[PDB]
Design an enzyme around this catalytic site. Structure first.
Site, PDB file in Angstrom:
ATOM      1  N   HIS A 143      -1.022   9.648   0.151  1.00  0.00           N
ATOM      2  CA  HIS A 143      -2.042   8.634   0.061  1.00  0.00           C
ATOM      3  C   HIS A 143      -2.875   8.756  -1.201  1.00  0.00           C
ATOM      4  O   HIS A 143      -3.080   9.854  -1.755  1.00  0.00           O
ATOM      5  CB  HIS A 143      -3.098   8.661   1.192  1.00  0.00           C
ATOM      6  CG  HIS A 143      -2.586   9.062   2.523  1.00  0.00           C
ATOM      7  ND1 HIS A 143      -2.872  10.292   3.074  1.00  0.00           N
ATOM      8  CD2 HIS A 143      -1.817   8.398   3.431  1.00  0.00           C
ATOM      9  CE1 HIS A 143      -2.222  10.404   4.227  1.00  0.00           C
ATOM     10  NE2 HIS A 143      -1.592   9.264   4.478  1.00  0.00           N
ATOM     11  N   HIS A 164      -6.570   8.648  -2.289  1.00  0.00           N
ATOM     12  CA  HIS A 164      -7.926   8.923  -1.742  1.00  0.00           C
ATOM     13  C   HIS A 164      -9.013   8.356  -2.658  1.00  0.00           C
ATOM     14  O   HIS A 164      -8.805   8.110  -3.873  1.00  0.00           O
ATOM     15  CB  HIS A 164      -8.100  10.437  -1.522  1.00  0.00           C
ATOM     16  CG  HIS A 164      -7.393  10.954  -0.312  1.00  0.00           C
ATOM     17  ND1 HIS A 164      -8.073  11.468   0.774  1.00  0.00           N
ATOM     18  CD2 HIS A 164      -6.088  10.965   0.026  1.00  0.00           C
ATOM     19  CE1 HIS A 164      -7.204  11.822   1.709  1.00  0.00           C
ATOM     20  NE2 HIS A 164      -5.991  11.539   1.279  1.00  0.00           N
ATOM     21  N   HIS A 223      -9.363   8.206   2.632  1.00  0.00           N
ATOM     22  CA  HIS A 223      -8.363   7.309   2.055  1.00  0.00           C
ATOM     23  C   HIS A 223      -9.074   6.174   1.338  1.00  0.00           C
ATOM     24  O   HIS A 223     -10.123   5.684   1.769  1.00  0.00           O
ATOM     25  CB  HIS A 223      -7.399   6.733   3.121  1.00  0.00           C
ATOM     26  CG  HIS A 223      -6.615   7.770   3.852  1.00  0.00           C
ATOM     27  ND1 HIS A 223      -5.616   7.462   4.743  1.00  0.00           N
ATOM     28  CD2 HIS A 223      -6.647   9.128   3.779  1.00  0.00           C
ATOM     29  CE1 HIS A 223      -5.067   8.568   5.199  1.00  0.00           C
ATOM     30  NE2 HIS A 223      -5.691   9.600   4.643  1.00  0.00           N
ATOM     31  N   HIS A 243      -6.523   2.564   9.106  1.00  0.00           N
ATOM     32  CA  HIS A 243      -5.312   3.239   8.666  1.00  0.00           C
ATOM     33  C   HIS A 243      -4.034   2.622   9.219  1.00  0.00           C
ATOM     34  O   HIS A 243      -3.984   2.253  10.433  1.00  0.00           O
ATOM     35  CB  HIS A 243      -5.359   4.732   9.039  1.00  0.00           C
ATOM     36  CG  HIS A 243      -4.201   5.510   8.501  1.00  0.00           C
ATOM     37  ND1 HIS A 243      -4.058   5.807   7.162  1.00  0.00           N
ATOM     38  CD2 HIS A 243      -3.104   5.988   9.114  1.00  0.00           C
ATOM     39  CE1 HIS A 243      -2.923   6.465   6.998  1.00  0.00           C
ATOM     40  NE2 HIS A 243      -2.330   6.585   8.166  1.00  0.00           N
ATOM     41  N   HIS A 247      -5.017   0.932   4.840  1.00  0.00           N
ATOM     42  CA  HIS A 247      -5.942   1.162   3.752  1.00  0.00           C
ATOM     43  C   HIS A 247      -5.191   0.833   2.443  1.00  0.00           C
ATOM     44  O   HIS A 247      -3.984   1.011   2.384  1.00  0.00           O
ATOM     45  CB  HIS A 247      -6.342   2.659   3.703  1.00  0.00           C
ATOM     46  CG  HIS A 247      -6.986   3.152   4.946  1.00  0.00           C
ATOM     47  ND1 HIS A 247      -6.710   4.408   5.484  1.00  0.00           N
ATOM     48  CD2 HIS A 247      -7.938   2.590   5.727  1.00  0.00           C
ATOM     49  CE1 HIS A 247      -7.511   4.591   6.533  1.00  0.00           C
ATOM     50  NE2 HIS A 247      -8.266   3.517   6.688  1.00  0.00           N
ATOM     51  N   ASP A 253      -2.797   3.705   1.533  1.00  0.00           N
ATOM     52  CA  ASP A 253      -1.781   4.128   2.431  1.00  0.00           C
ATOM     53  C   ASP A 253      -0.335   3.964   1.952  1.00  0.00           C
ATOM     54  O   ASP A 253       0.235   2.892   2.124  1.00  0.00           O
ATOM     55  CB  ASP A 253      -2.003   3.349   3.754  1.00  0.00           C
ATOM     56  CG  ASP A 253      -3.222   3.840   4.513  1.00  0.00           C
ATOM     57  OD1 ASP A 253      -3.775   4.925   4.190  1.00  0.00           O
ATOM     58  OD2 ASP A 253      -3.693   3.186   5.433  1.00  0.00           O
ATOM     59  N   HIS A 300       0.185  15.722   2.025  1.00  0.00           N
ATOM     60  CA  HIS A 300      -0.370  16.414   3.215  1.00  0.00           C
ATOM     61  C   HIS A 300       0.590  17.403   3.881  1.00  0.00           C
ATOM     62  O   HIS A 300       1.772  17.394   3.667  1.00  0.00           O
ATOM     63  CB  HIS A 300      -0.835  15.389   4.231  1.00  0.00           C
ATOM     64  CG  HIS A 300      -2.067  14.676   3.821  1.00  0.00           C
ATOM     65  ND1 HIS A 300      -3.318  15.041   4.278  1.00  0.00           N
ATOM     66  CD2 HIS A 300      -2.259  13.632   2.981  1.00  0.00           C
ATOM     67  CE1 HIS A 300      -4.218  14.231   3.764  1.00  0.00           C
ATOM     68  NE2 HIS A 300      -3.600  13.357   2.983  1.00  0.00           N
ATOM     69  N   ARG A 323      -4.594  19.170   3.194  1.00  0.00           N
ATOM     70  CA  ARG A 323      -4.173  18.620   1.873  1.00  0.00           C
ATOM     71  C   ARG A 323      -3.452  19.718   1.120  1.00  0.00           C
ATOM     72  O   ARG A 323      -4.044  20.792   0.840  1.00  0.00           O
ATOM     73  CB  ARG A 323      -5.402  18.105   1.117  1.00  0.00           C
ATOM     74  CG  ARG A 323      -6.130  17.057   1.890  1.00  0.00           C
ATOM     75  CD  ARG A 323      -7.442  16.640   1.316  1.00  0.00           C
ATOM     76  NE  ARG A 323      -8.054  15.658   2.210  1.00  0.00           N
ATOM     77  CZ  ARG A 323      -9.015  14.766   1.944  1.00  0.00           C
ATOM     78  NH1 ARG A 323      -9.618  14.688   0.756  1.00  0.00           N
ATOM     79  NH2 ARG A 323      -9.453  13.977   2.933  1.00  0.00           N
TER      80      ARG A 323
HETATM   81 CU   LIG Z   1      -4.209  11.531   2.237  1.00  0.00          CU
HETATM   82 ZN   LIG Z   2      -5.233   5.555   5.400  1.00  0.00          ZN
END
Ligand SMILES: [Cu+2]
Ligand SMILES: [Zn+2]
Ligand SMILES: COc1ccc(C)cc1N
Ligand SMILES: COc1ccc(C)cc1N
Ligand SMILES: [Cu+2]
Ligand SMILES: [Zn+2]
Lengths: 153, 153
Positions: B46, B48, B63, B71, B80, B83, B120, B143
């Site tokens: 993602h 951020h 995010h 999400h 998002h 995403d 992640h 993360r």
């Molecule tokens: Cu993320």
């Molecule tokens: Zn998200």
């Protein structure tokens, strides 16, 4: 306000955190933070064109120069947008940074977000040096540490 | 033709390089590269909100979500901006990434330049995991590696 941050990393270790704040998009940018692990004396300090650190700091390319000018000090009319002069470190190897700049921005065509901040091996002569290199890089030598400038909360 | 790049690093052995390319303003963005040092399986991937790495990948915040959505997966309307789903690693621990996305952009208000890309620990359930954290973070967990997205040549 618009805010940005840069984490500088290089061999030493050289480590720095530099903060940017611009209250209004037609206003100056306050630049502050600390860089440790460098030699006593002046070190060139610039925004470089690309936020690419794929092969290290060399990937960042030349000084950010959207107006196609020659190199200078932050006080000169004839400067690159990225020309932020020198940071000065003490015997402890620490450079405390407190700059206000009217030419960089955190939005619009002079925006530095997503570009690379670089601290150099040697002093930037601010384009007042002897040779042609003065008018391109200010003879600041190798790149000791860099990082990409990011949007901050 | 706009281009951006991200170098992913963490506190462990997770390294990646991810390239972005957008031929037209408001056209799709092609996202590609490689990530090594992860476990076999799906890893949440993602953009951020912040390009802040001051205290590592945690500083990047949530995010990227300028439209205040829940999400989801990249194929969902409810997602998002940030995403980008999952990258999948093989037994060698290498994830090859080839994505095309029309929600992210490299210009305008959905711009990702100067924000942080994060890979992640676990799979992103694409918001269909049926707990409440499915609809916020997708349960992708810690993360592992991250970097600021920079402007490329
Ligand atoms: Cu993320
Ligand atoms: Zn998200
Ligand atoms: C560049 O000037 C500054 C502006 C704001 C803060 C918090 C510190 C400094 N030095
Ligand atoms: C532009 O797309 C690509 C280029 C090169 C490689 C190795 C993969 C992709 N997707
Ligand atoms: Cu420089
Ligand atoms: Zn310059």
């Amino acid at each position: 306000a618009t805010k940005a941050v840069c984490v500088l990393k290089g061999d030493g270790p050289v480590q720095g955190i530099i903060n940017f704040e611009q209250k209004e998009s037609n206003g100056p940018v306050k630049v502050w933070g600390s860089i440790k692990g460098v030699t006593e004396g002046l070190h060139g300090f610039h925004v470089h064109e690309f936020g690419d650190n794929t092969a290290g700091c060399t990937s960042a390319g030349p000084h950010f120069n959207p107006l196609s000018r020659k190199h200078g000090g932050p006080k000169d009319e004839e400067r690159h947008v990225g020309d932020l002069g020198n940071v000065t470190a003490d015997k402890d190897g620490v450079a405390d940074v407190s700059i206000e700049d009217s030419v960089i921005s955190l939005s619009g065509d002079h925006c530095i977000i997503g570009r690379t901040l670089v601290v150099h091996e040697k002093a930037d002569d601010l384009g007042k040096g002897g040779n042609e290199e003065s008018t391109k890089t200010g003879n600041a030598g190798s790149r000791l540490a860099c990082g990409v400038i990011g949007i901050a909360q």
